[PDB]
A paper describes a structure:
Rac1 is a major regulator of actin dynamics, with GTP-bound Rac1 promoting actin assembly via the Scar/WAVE complex. CYRI competes with Scar/WAVE for interaction with Rac1 in a feedback loop regulating actin dynamics. Recently, a novel effector of Rac1, Fam49B also known as CYRI-B (CYFIP-related Rac interactor), has been reported to bind to active Rac1 and oppose the activation of the Scar/WAVE complex (Fort et al., 2018). CYRI-B, its isoform CYRI-A and the Scar/WAVE complex all possess an evolutionarily conserved Rac1 binding domain (RBD) termed the DUF1394 domain.
Residue numbers in the entry:
A (entry chain CCC): 9 to 88, 96 to 144, 154 to 300
B (entry chain BBB): -2 to 177
């Protein structure tokens, strides 16, 4: 499946950020090695220190290429009725969440480019008496202030540029609608006081079920129908992820305050909602 | 020391003018006596200029004539250019008006230029000045450097030494000040 293609690479995302934060570098060993070129004993300590760091930098770069390939593979499936387009929006939010941290840590860490530059500077020296083509791409990767954002933006623009028949809106709509719903969740009006972190998450669950029930009543086909925009099966699963004590009020509300739940057309898998 | 303004700064100039050394001397406060050519390299440093934080992205380029087709791929989205020539090498000093100004303008015509004079410590050295005599040559003096900067339309002419670090800090500070 190419729908959990981005989720498969994100498995190691926590490990990448954890390794990137712990990346102290080897600026001290590199510096003293340059200060005393002739000291071969000190050149070994510097070179020996660099190997570990480069291997992690290659591990970080290769991750961005897999994440790039996974994102384009995800956008590729867009092309090919009953389009599950939440995958696009869900995985966009997930990789962007990771992307902001990766860029933030790299941004404020000049040791990364320092180490790398030394590494390829001492390869040449060693040329006198990793893959070379890969190293050049890696050099250009870490040269940027925001490598991941640059990689994502380039990858998405590469997709739309070689899919000109599809308008920019198709792919950029999810990105603009997500920012408006977030504002709805996070924005606090004048009439009431600001919600807590517990209330905003609670609120978010209520509106989700709230708009579904109101949509079910006003929209002809409803929220339960096979040819619906709601995709409830997924919305109920999110509710049953939550503690049983929490969301019982919302869970019940769907059971008896809907319109097209009990009608014949509704799936019997959706009806699987009991309580004791 | 958190995140700052991302300012890209590409350094161009011939081989052995001191492009790589003045970047390594600035960021790491170390001077490599060993000479190894660099096709392309990059460094960075979080610095404070005029009370504003800056993540100064430094792009080191090749000086050799064999990397003319490969050098200009690092040019796009440049905020400032450092055309570096050695003060102890007239050839390099003319290559400024002959090649670099044409080249950097050709790709990025609206991006500022900072004309930098490298190896300032060698201009007043018997050993180094006798060899210029030997090769029938007179070191590029300040008036010449400034006159050249005025011709190419560089916003500032600076002269510094990567070894002594005399006016090394001022070059990058002025490089940032041009993009604020
Ligand atoms: N005395 C002195 N030597 C310097 C100075 N700056 C650089 N050098 C010397 O210049 C040589 C290397 O210059 P470098 O910075 O590598 O030149 P480059 O601009 O990188 N040339 P390339 O395009 O080939 O990479 C070394 O011998 C180094 O010690 C300086 O200010 N003073
Ligand atoms: Mg160099």
């Amino acid at each position: 499946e190419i729908y959990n293609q981005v989720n498969v690479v994100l498995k190691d995302a926590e490990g990448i950020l954890e390794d990137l934060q712990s990346y102290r570098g080897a600026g001290h060993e590199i510096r003293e090695a340059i200060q005393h070129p002739a000291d071969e004993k000190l050149q070994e300590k510097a070179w020996g220190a660099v190997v570990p760091l480069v291997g992690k930098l290659k591990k970080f770069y290769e991750f961005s290429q897999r994440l790039e390939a996974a994102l384009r593979g995800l956008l590729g499936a867009l092309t090919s009725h009953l389009e599950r387009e939440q995958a696009l929006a869900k995985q966009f939010a997930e990789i962007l969440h990771f992307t902001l941290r990766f860029d933030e840590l790299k941004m404020t860490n000049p040791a990364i480019q320092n180490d790398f530059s030394y590494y390829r500077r001492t390869l040449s020296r060693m040329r006198i008496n990793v893959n070379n083509e890969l190293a050049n791409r890696m050099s250009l990767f870490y040269a940027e202030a925001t490598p991941m954002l640059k990689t994502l933006s380039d990858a998405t623009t590469k997709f739309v540029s070689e899919n000109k028949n599809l308008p920019i809106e198709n792919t950029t709509d999810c990105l603009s609608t997500m920012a408006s719903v977030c504002r709805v969740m996070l924005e606090t009006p004048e009439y009431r006081s600001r919600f807590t972190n517990e209330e905003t998450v609670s609120f978010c669950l209520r509106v989700m079920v709230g708009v579904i029930i109101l949509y079910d009543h006003v929209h002809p086909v409803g929220a339960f129908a096979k040819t619906s925009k709601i995709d409830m099966k997924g919305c109920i699963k999110v509710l049953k992820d939550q503690p049983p004590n929490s969301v019982e009020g919302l869970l019940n509300a769907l059971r008896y305050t809907t319109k097209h739940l009990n009608d014949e057309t509704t799936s019997k898998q959706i009806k699987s909602m009991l309580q004791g | 020391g958190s995140a700052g303004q991302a300012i890209k700064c590409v350094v161009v100039g011939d081989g052995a003018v001191g492009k790589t050394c003045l970047l390594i001397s600035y960021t790491t406060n170390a001077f490599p006596g060993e000479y190894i050519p660099t096709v392309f390299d990059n460094y960075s440093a979080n610095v404070m200029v005029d009370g504003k934080p800056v993540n100064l992205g430094l792009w080191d380029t090749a000086g050799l004539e064999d990397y003319d087709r490969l050098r200009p791929l690092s040019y796009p989205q440049t905020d400032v250019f450092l055309i570096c020539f050695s003060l102890v090498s007239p050839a390099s000093f003319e290559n400024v008006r002959a090649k670099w100004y044409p080249e950097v303008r050709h790709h990025c015509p609206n991006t500022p230029i900072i004309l930098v004079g490298t190896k300032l410590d060698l201009r007043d050295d018997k050993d180094t000045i006798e060899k210029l005599k030997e090769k029938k040559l007179t070191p590029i003096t300040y008036p010449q450097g400034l006159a050249m900067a005025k011709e190419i339309g560089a916003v500032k002419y600076l002269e510094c030494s990567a070894l002594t670090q005399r006016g090394l800090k001022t070059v990058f500070d002025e490089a940032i000040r041009a993009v604020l």
